[PDB]
Amino acid sequence: RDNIQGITKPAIRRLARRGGVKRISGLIYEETRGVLKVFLENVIRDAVTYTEHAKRKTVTAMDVVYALKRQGRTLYGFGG
Amino acid sequence: VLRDNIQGITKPAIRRLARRGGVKRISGLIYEETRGVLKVFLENVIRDAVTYTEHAKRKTVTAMDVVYALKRQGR
Amino acid sequence: LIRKLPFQRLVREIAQDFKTDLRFQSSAVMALQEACEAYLVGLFEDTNLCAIHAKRVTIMPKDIQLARRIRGER
Amino acid sequence: RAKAKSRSSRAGLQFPVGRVHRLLRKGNYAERVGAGAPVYLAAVLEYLTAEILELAGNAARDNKKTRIIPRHLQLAIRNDEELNKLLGRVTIAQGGVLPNIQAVLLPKK
Amino acid sequence: KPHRYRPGTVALREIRRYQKSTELLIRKLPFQRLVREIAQDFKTDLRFQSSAVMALQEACEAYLVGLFEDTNLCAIHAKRVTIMPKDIQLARRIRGER
Amino acid sequence: RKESYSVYVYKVLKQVHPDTGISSKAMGIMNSFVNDIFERIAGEASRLAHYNKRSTITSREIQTAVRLLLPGELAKHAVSEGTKAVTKYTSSK
DNA sequence: TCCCCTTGGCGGTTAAAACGCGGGGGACAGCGCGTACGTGCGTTTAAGCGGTGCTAGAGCTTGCTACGACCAATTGAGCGGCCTCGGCACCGGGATTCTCCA
DNA sequence: TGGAGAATCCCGGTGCCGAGGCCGCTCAATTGGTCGTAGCAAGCTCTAGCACCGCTTAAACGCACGTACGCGCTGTCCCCCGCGTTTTAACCGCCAAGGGGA
């Protein structure tokens, strides 16, 4: 399935432009995919504990927000 | 009254701290930069530790006030 | 690493700006020094990574600035 | 029985001192909650709401917009040396980034 | 003969565009499949609210954008206009994250 | 029944910019901010109580939390406006 | 038994990703110099340890009343639902800006 | 400096859709009373924090001197951009299922 390859080079390029990056080594695309997957694992793992410890099957935006705030990366906008 | 005591972290003390961090060679511009870094850090921990000391209505800052102040800087 | 008496006068000097005539426990001074030693040792390491990046052997204030900016202190 | 006067009205606050009292109790922050703690806290919440909304209302006007968009909140927060300290590890949905190009990257003259 | 801008001209135009815009830069449906692909390892027949995946794009795009800025600083510290994987590795390692 | 500060944020809005509006998406960020700063102050006031072995969240513990939590000139004006509100509360009734 | 809502499939169509290719300019290796920093030695300066004296203030006990928890009665502030118009975006094409080669 | 052409700004028109305001209700904040208690105030102890003195030596520092490492300068090439062409799959709509919960 390997949907991490669905994070295409242009999408990683646009993220780098918003990051103010002028020139990008072609080796960056596979390092950025590896970074993203390592990050997105940790959040979904912890959110799923909130979902199941609340005896739900649906993971909810506040499960993500609690996981994010637990990981020190507080996100505003989706809920208080 | 105390003044100029930031010079009391001597250059060799900065070297000892730097070599403990693995640094092999130290620009002379590191010494003044490190003193600024030390004082900006130490001010923040002291400020909160004194804010805890005032809350207890104490005149003595305690090791537990430091621990709480450090724990907050940890955040 | 740092000597005790000069660091003691340093923390008392800083305290004057927050409250005059504060007392400090002997244990409170040491808890501050050991945290400052651990802060600086653990920062010089992050500057050495900035110096060993860019092919240098010698750490520069530019490395402290990059370390502190990426640690988030700047 | 006298007509009720909301605890906010007596403090002059827009923020709800009664709700802030409940939430301090419901949250089990401590066994007891003094009558003044909800008043002091609600005043600080109302202040910090007013600070951010003036800077974001400026940013909105600077962009000819009447409504605060999330963009205007992020611009206001990141342009302020104290809101960026308070929210330095906070992420804002559709906030974006500050326009900021490193000068070494600009085209050489 | 048609025009052609110099190398680095359109990079600056793209920076000035994407630092001005706020809309999300990763595609929607490819990220849903990435989230559900990851979720499969943790529990079968999990569901996500649409807001739960959209909350999760916003968190990770901000993580990647915020990392690129730190790696760009590591690139220009090596006196490079070009970011390279060891810049990502340095940035994360200074962040205590690698 | 889900509770939101949006009604109170909007009253504060008309006292800083009577002409200016807000989007519900921006309001969601404001509501997230109010909840996050309530939680941070209340959590530190809770710790201040516990550290001092006191059963009561007092205004002195909101004040010290605000001095611990907020930076610089935000802390000093926040302490001012809180103490004014507590004074008006005590004086009024 | 019945409603709600999340996942999957179908189709188009269309915009964004993938692929190609020339070239340029930036990465990067090689080289020279000079200066800037580590090492060594004599000097001094003050840190650290052993000893003396005093008093502030942490920390504990005791006593009582203030004040907040509790709860029953009352109501109005604030939320869920509905409605509309005006702010803002997207569209188009004319005007100004900016870049790059001459 | 010029200039053309491609890129961006502004200005006007159109739409739509979401914000701001209105109305019903409720349930959640406020009022008035009671009772426990907790923390606020007093008073005693004695602890350990601060000041000082004097000796010791080991750490600091000023300067001498070299060489190792920083940095500018030169060459190369390669490899990443930028723009044209091809392809795919992303996104929107609409329907389906069944799956869970009451």
mmCIF file of N, CA, C and O (backbone and C1' of nucleotides) in Angstrom, chain A residues 69 74-80, chain D residues 15-16 19 42 44-58 67-77 83 86-87 90-95, chain F residues 3-14 16-17 20-40, chain H residues 20:
data_model
loop_
_atom_site.group_PDB
_atom_site.id
_atom_site.type_symbol
_atom_site.label_atom_id
_atom_site.label_comp_id
_atom_site.label_asym_id
_atom_site.label_seq_id
_atom_site.Cartn_x
_atom_site.Cartn_y
_atom_site.Cartn_z
ATOM 1 N N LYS A 69 -1.362 17.989 22.337
ATOM 2 C CA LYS A 69 -1.004 18.720 23.548
ATOM 3 C C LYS A 69 -0.160 17.872 24.495
ATOM 4 O O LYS A 69 0.753 18.387 25.150
ATOM 5 N N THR A 74 0.643 21.987 20.962
ATOM 6 C CA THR A 74 -0.730 22.459 21.107
ATOM 7 C C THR A 74 -1.278 23.076 19.828
ATOM 8 O O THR A 74 -0.686 24.001 19.268
ATOM 9 N N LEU A 75 -2.413 22.553 19.369
ATOM 10 C CA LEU A 75 -3.094 23.022 18.169
ATOM 11 C C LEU A 75 -4.376 23.734 18.585
ATOM 12 O O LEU A 75 -5.236 23.136 19.239
ATOM 13 N N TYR A 76 -4.500 25.007 18.210
ATOM 14 C CA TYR A 76 -5.740 25.754 18.370
ATOM 15 C C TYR A 76 -6.622 25.665 17.134
ATOM 16 O O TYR A 76 -6.141 25.541 16.005
ATOM 17 N N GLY A 77 -7.929 25.721 17.364
ATOM 18 C CA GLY A 77 -8.899 25.842 16.296
ATOM 19 C C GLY A 77 -9.904 24.717 16.209
ATOM 20 O O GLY A 77 -11.074 24.940 15.887
ATOM 21 N N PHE A 78 -9.455 23.500 16.491
ATOM 22 C CA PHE A 78 -10.317 22.331 16.431
ATOM 23 C C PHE A 78 -11.078 22.066 17.724
ATOM 24 O O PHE A 78 -12.134 21.425 17.682
ATOM 25 N N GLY A 79 -10.575 22.534 18.863
ATOM 26 C CA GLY A 79 -11.383 22.562 20.068
ATOM 27 C C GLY A 79 -10.612 22.912 21.324
ATOM 28 O O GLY A 79 -9.386 22.770 21.375
ATOM 29 N N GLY A 80 -11.326 23.361 22.351
ATOM 30 C CA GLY A 80 -10.707 23.710 23.615
ATOM 31 C C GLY A 80 -10.772 22.604 24.648
ATOM 32 O O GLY A 80 -11.552 22.668 25.596
ATOM 33 N N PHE D 15 -16.516 38.628 30.896
ATOM 34 C CA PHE D 15 -16.344 37.194 31.055
ATOM 35 C C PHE D 15 -17.126 36.647 32.252
ATOM 36 O O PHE D 15 -17.302 37.333 33.262
ATOM 37 N N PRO D 16 -17.613 35.397 32.151
ATOM 38 C CA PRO D 16 -18.602 34.880 33.106
ATOM 39 C C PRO D 16 -17.981 34.326 34.382
ATOM 40 O O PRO D 16 -17.496 33.192 34.412
ATOM 41 N N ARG D 19 -19.572 30.903 35.578
ATOM 42 C CA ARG D 19 -19.029 29.755 34.852
ATOM 43 C C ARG D 19 -17.575 29.468 35.222
ATOM 44 O O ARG D 19 -17.198 28.308 35.409
ATOM 45 N N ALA D 42 -11.245 35.494 35.682
ATOM 46 C CA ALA D 42 -12.076 35.980 34.582
ATOM 47 C C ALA D 42 -11.609 37.332 34.060
ATOM 48 O O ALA D 42 -11.744 37.614 32.865
ATOM 49 N N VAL D 44 -8.421 38.298 34.007
ATOM 50 C CA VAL D 44 -7.227 37.996 33.221
ATOM 51 C C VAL D 44 -7.579 37.354 31.881
ATOM 52 O O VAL D 44 -6.954 37.650 30.857
ATOM 53 N N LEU D 45 -8.575 36.468 31.858
ATOM 54 C CA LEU D 45 -9.050 35.934 30.584
ATOM 55 C C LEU D 45 -9.587 37.033 29.674
ATOM 56 O O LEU D 45 -9.344 37.019 28.462
ATOM 57 N N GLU D 46 -10.331 37.986 30.236
ATOM 58 C CA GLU D 46 -10.893 39.077 29.443
ATOM 59 C C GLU D 46 -9.814 40.022 28.924
ATOM 60 O O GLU D 46 -9.912 40.529 27.803
ATOM 61 N N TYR D 47 -8.790 40.282 29.737
ATOM 62 C CA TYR D 47 -7.642 41.069 29.297
ATOM 63 C C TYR D 47 -6.905 40.428 28.124
ATOM 64 O O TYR D 47 -6.718 41.057 27.076
ATOM 65 N N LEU D 48 -6.478 39.174 28.280
ATOM 66 C CA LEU D 48 -5.745 38.500 27.212
ATOM 67 C C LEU D 48 -6.577 38.315 25.950
ATOM 68 O O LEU D 48 -6.025 38.296 24.848
ATOM 69 N N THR D 49 -7.892 38.168 26.084
ATOM 70 C CA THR D 49 -8.757 38.196 24.910
ATOM 71 C C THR D 49 -8.763 39.568 24.243
ATOM 72 O O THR D 49 -8.777 39.665 23.011
ATOM 73 N N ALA D 50 -8.742 40.641 25.037
ATOM 74 C CA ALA D 50 -8.761 41.993 24.481
ATOM 75 C C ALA D 50 -7.447 42.366 23.802
ATOM 76 O O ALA D 50 -7.455 42.960 22.718
ATOM 77 N N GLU D 51 -6.314 42.038 24.423
ATOM 78 C CA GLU D 51 -5.007 42.227 23.796
ATOM 79 C C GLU D 51 -4.923 41.608 22.401
ATOM 80 O O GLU D 51 -4.657 42.303 21.416
ATOM 81 N N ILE D 52 -5.133 40.296 22.301
ATOM 82 C CA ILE D 52 -5.037 39.610 21.011
ATOM 83 C C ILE D 52 -6.040 40.153 19.993
ATOM 84 O O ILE D 52 -5.721 40.271 18.803
ATOM 85 N N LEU D 53 -7.259 40.485 20.423
ATOM 86 C CA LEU D 53 -8.252 40.970 19.465
ATOM 87 C C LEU D 53 -7.985 42.384 18.956
ATOM 88 O O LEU D 53 -8.442 42.727 17.861
ATOM 89 N N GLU D 54 -7.284 43.231 19.712
ATOM 90 C CA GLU D 54 -6.927 44.533 19.148
ATOM 91 C C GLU D 54 -5.844 44.399 18.081
ATOM 92 O O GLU D 54 -5.930 45.027 17.020
ATOM 93 N N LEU D 55 -4.819 43.585 18.345
ATOM 94 C CA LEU D 55 -3.753 43.370 17.373
ATOM 95 C C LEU D 55 -4.269 42.671 16.119
ATOM 96 O O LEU D 55 -3.836 42.985 15.004
ATOM 97 N N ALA D 56 -5.187 41.717 16.282
ATOM 98 C CA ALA D 56 -5.777 41.040 15.131
ATOM 99 C C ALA D 56 -6.756 41.933 14.383
ATOM 100 O O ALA D 56 -6.873 41.830 13.157
ATOM 101 N N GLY D 57 -7.473 42.801 15.095
ATOM 102 C CA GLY D 57 -8.302 43.794 14.433
ATOM 103 C C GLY D 57 -7.507 44.830 13.662
ATOM 104 O O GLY D 57 -7.966 45.326 12.630
ATOM 105 N N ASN D 58 -6.317 45.180 14.153
ATOM 106 C CA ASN D 58 -5.389 45.986 13.363
ATOM 107 C C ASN D 58 -4.940 45.252 12.102
ATOM 108 O O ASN D 58 -5.065 45.775 10.990
ATOM 109 N N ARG D 67 -13.497 41.331 9.000
ATOM 110 C CA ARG D 67 -13.562 40.182 9.890
ATOM 111 C C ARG D 67 -12.159 39.697 10.213
ATOM 112 O O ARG D 67 -11.302 39.604 9.330
ATOM 113 N N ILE D 68 -11.932 39.378 11.484
ATOM 114 C CA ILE D 68 -10.738 38.640 11.869
ATOM 115 C C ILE D 68 -10.808 37.237 11.280
ATOM 116 O O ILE D 68 -11.709 36.454 11.599
ATOM 117 N N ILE D 69 -9.859 36.927 10.405
ATOM 118 C CA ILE D 69 -9.629 35.592 9.861
ATOM 119 C C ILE D 69 -8.541 34.956 10.723
ATOM 120 O O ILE D 69 -7.770 35.690 11.356
ATOM 121 N N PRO D 70 -8.453 33.625 10.816
ATOM 122 C CA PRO D 70 -7.313 33.011 11.520
ATOM 123 C C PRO D 70 -5.952 33.553 11.109
ATOM 124 O O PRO D 70 -5.027 33.582 11.931
ATOM 125 N N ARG D 71 -5.801 33.963 9.847
ATOM 126 C CA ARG D 71 -4.573 34.605 9.388
ATOM 127 C C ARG D 71 -4.217 35.813 10.249
ATOM 128 O O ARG D 71 -3.067 35.976 10.673
ATOM 129 N N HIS D 72 -5.206 36.665 10.525
ATOM 130 C CA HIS D 72 -4.981 37.887 11.292
ATOM 131 C C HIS D 72 -4.615 37.615 12.747
ATOM 132 O O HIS D 72 -3.857 38.388 13.343
ATOM 133 N N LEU D 73 -5.137 36.542 13.337
ATOM 134 C CA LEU D 73 -4.715 36.146 14.677
ATOM 135 C C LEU D 73 -3.261 35.685 14.708
ATOM 136 O O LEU D 73 -2.491 36.093 15.584
ATOM 137 N N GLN D 74 -2.867 34.837 13.755
ATOM 138 C CA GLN D 74 -1.481 34.377 13.683
ATOM 139 C C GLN D 74 -0.501 35.516 13.416
ATOM 140 O O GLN D 74 0.558 35.588 14.048
ATOM 141 N N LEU D 75 -0.827 36.406 12.480
ATOM 142 C CA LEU D 75 0.009 37.583 12.250
ATOM 143 C C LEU D 75 0.152 38.432 13.509
ATOM 144 O O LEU D 75 1.263 38.819 13.886
ATOM 145 N N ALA D 76 -0.967 38.734 14.168
ATOM 146 C CA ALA D 76 -0.937 39.490 15.420
ATOM 147 C C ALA D 76 -0.095 38.811 16.496
ATOM 148 O O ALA D 76 0.677 39.473 17.197
ATOM 149 N N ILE D 77 -0.237 37.496 16.649
ATOM 150 C CA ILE D 77 0.510 36.773 17.677
ATOM 151 C C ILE D 77 2.005 36.766 17.375
ATOM 152 O O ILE D 77 2.830 37.021 18.260
ATOM 153 N N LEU D 83 2.959 37.956 23.019
ATOM 154 C CA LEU D 83 2.065 36.903 22.551
ATOM 155 C C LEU D 83 2.840 35.771 21.887
ATOM 156 O O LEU D 83 2.454 34.602 21.995
ATOM 157 N N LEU D 86 4.046 33.815 24.821
ATOM 158 C CA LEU D 86 2.956 33.058 25.426
ATOM 159 C C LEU D 86 2.511 31.898 24.544
ATOM 160 O O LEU D 86 2.161 30.825 25.051
ATOM 161 N N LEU D 87 2.526 32.086 23.225
ATOM 162 C CA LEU D 87 2.036 31.096 22.273
ATOM 163 C C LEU D 87 3.142 30.559 21.366
ATOM 164 O O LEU D 87 2.879 30.141 20.237
ATOM 165 N N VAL D 90 2.496 27.006 20.142
ATOM 166 C CA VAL D 90 1.095 26.801 19.799
ATOM 167 C C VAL D 90 0.952 26.917 18.287
ATOM 168 O O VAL D 90 1.578 27.776 17.656
ATOM 169 N N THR D 91 0.135 26.040 17.710
ATOM 170 C CA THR D 91 -0.117 25.986 16.277
ATOM 171 C C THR D 91 -1.544 26.431 15.993
ATOM 172 O O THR D 91 -2.482 26.010 16.674
ATOM 173 N N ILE D 92 -1.704 27.273 14.977
ATOM 174 C CA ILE D 92 -2.988 27.874 14.645
ATOM 175 C C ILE D 92 -3.441 27.358 13.290
ATOM 176 O O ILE D 92 -2.741 27.520 12.284
ATOM 177 N N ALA D 93 -4.603 26.715 13.280
ATOM 178 C CA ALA D 93 -5.246 26.249 12.058
ATOM 179 C C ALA D 93 -5.435 27.382 11.061
ATOM 180 O O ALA D 93 -6.033 28.411 11.387
ATOM 181 N N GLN D 94 -4.928 27.184 9.841
ATOM 182 C CA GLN D 94 -4.924 28.212 8.796
ATOM 183 C C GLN D 94 -4.261 29.515 9.237
ATOM 184 O O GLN D 94 -4.575 30.590 8.726
ATOM 185 N N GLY D 95 -3.330 29.437 10.186
ATOM 186 C CA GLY D 95 -2.591 30.631 10.564
ATOM 187 C C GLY D 95 -1.557 31.020 9.524
ATOM 188 O O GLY D 95 -1.316 32.207 9.288
ATOM 189 N N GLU F 3 -20.735 24.265 25.737
ATOM 190 C CA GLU F 3 -20.513 25.625 26.209
ATOM 191 C C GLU F 3 -19.292 26.238 25.532
ATOM 192 O O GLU F 3 -18.230 25.611 25.468
ATOM 193 N N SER F 4 -19.453 27.465 25.035
ATOM 194 C CA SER F 4 -18.414 28.168 24.296
ATOM 195 C C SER F 4 -18.342 29.613 24.768
ATOM 196 O O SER F 4 -19.373 30.242 25.023
ATOM 197 N N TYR F 5 -17.118 30.135 24.883
ATOM 198 C CA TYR F 5 -16.882 31.526 25.256
ATOM 199 C C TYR F 5 -17.209 32.515 24.143
ATOM 200 O O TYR F 5 -16.961 33.710 24.322
ATOM 201 N N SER F 6 -17.729 32.048 23.007
ATOM 202 C CA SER F 6 -17.871 32.898 21.827
ATOM 203 C C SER F 6 -18.703 34.145 22.104
ATOM 204 O O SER F 6 -18.404 35.225 21.582
ATOM 205 N N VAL F 7 -19.755 34.017 22.912
ATOM 206 C CA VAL F 7 -20.568 35.174 23.289
ATOM 207 C C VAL F 7 -19.753 36.207 24.066
ATOM 208 O O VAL F 7 -19.944 37.416 23.900
ATOM 209 N N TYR F 8 -18.827 35.757 24.914
ATOM 210 C CA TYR F 8 -18.010 36.685 25.693
ATOM 211 C C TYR F 8 -16.842 37.262 24.899
ATOM 212 O O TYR F 8 -16.506 38.441 25.058
ATOM 213 N N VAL F 9 -16.205 36.446 24.059
ATOM 214 C CA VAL F 9 -15.210 36.939 23.107
ATOM 215 C C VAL F 9 -15.782 38.046 22.227
ATOM 216 O O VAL F 9 -15.133 39.070 21.993
ATOM 217 N N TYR F 10 -17.006 37.863 21.737
ATOM 218 C CA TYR F 10 -17.643 38.874 20.897
ATOM 219 C C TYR F 10 -17.966 40.165 21.647
ATOM 220 O O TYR F 10 -17.921 41.246 21.050
ATOM 221 N N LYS F 11 -18.306 40.083 22.932
ATOM 222 C CA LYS F 11 -18.474 41.292 23.736
ATOM 223 C C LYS F 11 -17.157 42.026 23.969
ATOM 224 O O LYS F 11 -17.121 43.262 23.961
ATOM 225 N N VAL F 12 -16.069 41.289 24.181
ATOM 226 C CA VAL F 12 -14.743 41.901 24.248
ATOM 227 C C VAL F 12 -14.356 42.531 22.913
ATOM 228 O O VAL F 12 -13.766 43.616 22.870
ATOM 229 N N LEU F 13 -14.678 41.859 21.808
ATOM 230 C CA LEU F 13 -14.387 42.383 20.475
ATOM 231 C C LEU F 13 -14.970 43.778 20.253
ATOM 232 O O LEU F 13 -14.265 44.687 19.803
ATOM 233 N N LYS F 14 -16.256 43.967 20.549
ATOM 234 C CA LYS F 14 -16.876 45.283 20.392
ATOM 235 C C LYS F 14 -16.359 46.336 21.367
ATOM 236 O O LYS F 14 -16.690 47.514 21.199
ATOM 237 N N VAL F 16 -12.953 46.558 21.777
ATOM 238 C CA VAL F 16 -11.657 46.934 21.219
ATOM 239 C C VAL F 16 -11.788 47.438 19.787
ATOM 240 O O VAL F 16 -10.994 48.277 19.349
ATOM 241 N N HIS F 17 -12.778 46.947 19.045
ATOM 242 C CA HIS F 17 -12.976 47.349 17.650
ATOM 243 C C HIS F 17 -14.449 47.249 17.293
ATOM 244 O O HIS F 17 -14.905 46.250 16.724
ATOM 245 N N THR F 20 -15.347 45.852 13.895
ATOM 246 C CA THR F 20 -14.693 44.650 13.401
ATOM 247 C C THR F 20 -15.497 43.408 13.768
ATOM 248 O O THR F 20 -16.148 43.348 14.814
ATOM 249 N N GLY F 21 -15.441 42.409 12.888
ATOM 250 C CA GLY F 21 -16.108 41.147 13.089
ATOM 251 C C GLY F 21 -15.123 40.015 13.312
ATOM 252 O O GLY F 21 -13.917 40.220 13.462
ATOM 253 N N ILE F 22 -15.661 38.798 13.354
ATOM 254 C CA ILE F 22 -14.816 37.613 13.430
ATOM 255 C C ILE F 22 -15.513 36.458 12.725
ATOM 256 O O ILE F 22 -16.742 36.353 12.730
ATOM 257 N N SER F 23 -14.716 35.608 12.084
ATOM 258 C CA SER F 23 -15.208 34.363 11.514
ATOM 259 C C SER F 23 -15.358 33.301 12.597
ATOM 260 O O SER F 23 -14.626 33.288 13.591
ATOM 261 N N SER F 24 -16.325 32.404 12.395
ATOM 262 C CA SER F 24 -16.492 31.277 13.307
ATOM 263 C C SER F 24 -15.233 30.421 13.390
ATOM 264 O O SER F 24 -14.948 29.837 14.440
ATOM 265 N N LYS F 25 -14.475 30.336 12.297
ATOM 266 C CA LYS F 25 -13.202 29.620 12.310
ATOM 267 C C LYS F 25 -12.153 30.320 13.171
ATOM 268 O O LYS F 25 -11.395 29.660 13.890
ATOM 269 N N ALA F 26 -12.092 31.650 13.111
ATOM 270 C CA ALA F 26 -11.245 32.413 14.027
ATOM 271 C C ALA F 26 -11.767 32.373 15.458
ATOM 272 O O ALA F 26 -10.979 32.331 16.410
ATOM 273 N N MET F 27 -13.086 32.406 15.628
ATOM 274 C CA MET F 27 -13.682 32.255 16.953
ATOM 275 C C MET F 27 -13.323 30.917 17.595
ATOM 276 O O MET F 27 -13.037 30.859 18.797
ATOM 277 N N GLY F 28 -13.327 29.837 16.815
ATOM 278 C CA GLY F 28 -12.829 28.563 17.316
ATOM 279 C C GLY F 28 -11.402 28.612 17.833
ATOM 280 O O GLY F 28 -11.057 27.917 18.790
ATOM 281 N N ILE F 29 -10.546 29.419 17.205
ATOM 282 C CA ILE F 29 -9.203 29.625 17.744
ATOM 283 C C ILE F 29 -9.242 30.440 19.034
ATOM 284 O O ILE F 29 -8.520 30.138 19.991
ATOM 285 N N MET F 30 -10.076 31.479 19.084
ATOM 286 C CA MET F 30 -10.220 32.260 20.310
ATOM 287 C C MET F 30 -10.742 31.412 21.466
ATOM 288 O O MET F 30 -10.200 31.458 22.576
ATOM 289 N N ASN F 31 -11.795 30.630 21.221
ATOM 290 C CA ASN F 31 -12.300 29.703 22.230
ATOM 291 C C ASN F 31 -11.242 28.692 22.660
ATOM 292 O O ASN F 31 -11.161 28.332 23.839
ATOM 293 N N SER F 32 -10.426 28.218 21.718
ATOM 294 C CA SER F 32 -9.301 27.352 22.059
ATOM 295 C C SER F 32 -8.258 28.074 22.906
ATOM 296 O O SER F 32 -7.667 27.475 23.811
ATOM 297 N N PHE F 33 -8.004 29.350 22.619
ATOM 298 C CA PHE F 33 -7.057 30.125 23.416
ATOM 299 C C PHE F 33 -7.556 30.344 24.841
ATOM 300 O O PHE F 33 -6.806 30.151 25.806
ATOM 301 N N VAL F 34 -8.816 30.756 24.993
ATOM 302 C CA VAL F 34 -9.381 30.994 26.322
ATOM 303 C C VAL F 34 -9.344 29.730 27.172
ATOM 304 O O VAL F 34 -8.912 29.755 28.332
ATOM 305 N N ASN F 35 -9.796 28.608 26.611
ATOM 306 C CA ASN F 35 -9.696 27.327 27.305
ATOM 307 C C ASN F 35 -8.256 26.952 27.638
ATOM 308 O O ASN F 35 -7.984 26.438 28.728
ATOM 309 N N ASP F 36 -7.320 27.182 26.716
ATOM 310 C CA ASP F 36 -5.928 26.823 26.982
ATOM 311 C C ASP F 36 -5.289 27.686 28.062
ATOM 312 O O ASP F 36 -4.506 27.184 28.875
ATOM 313 N N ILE F 37 -5.604 28.978 28.099
ATOM 314 C CA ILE F 37 -5.019 29.821 29.136
ATOM 315 C C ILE F 37 -5.742 29.698 30.477
ATOM 316 O O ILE F 37 -5.110 29.826 31.531
ATOM 317 N N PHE F 38 -7.052 29.448 30.474
ATOM 318 C CA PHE F 38 -7.738 29.018 31.690
ATOM 319 C C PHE F 38 -7.094 27.778 32.303
ATOM 320 O O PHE F 38 -6.726 27.769 33.482
ATOM 321 N N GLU F 39 -6.951 26.720 31.504
ATOM 322 C CA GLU F 39 -6.314 25.482 31.949
ATOM 323 C C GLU F 39 -4.897 25.691 32.481
ATOM 324 O O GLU F 39 -4.516 25.084 33.487
ATOM 325 N N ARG F 40 -4.094 26.520 31.813
ATOM 326 C CA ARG F 40 -2.722 26.738 32.268
ATOM 327 C C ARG F 40 -2.656 27.504 33.584
ATOM 328 O O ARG F 40 -1.851 27.163 34.458
ATOM 329 P P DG H 20 -19.552 38.542 12.712
ATOM 330 O "O5'" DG H 20 -20.949 39.180 13.116
ATOM 331 C "C5'" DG H 20 -21.623 40.112 12.268
ATOM 332 C "C4'" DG H 20 -23.105 40.053 12.507
ATOM 333 C "C3'" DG H 20 -23.549 40.284 13.970
ATOM 334 O "O3'" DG H 20 -24.286 41.512 14.084
ATOM 335 C "C1'" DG H 20 -24.703 38.442 12.957
#
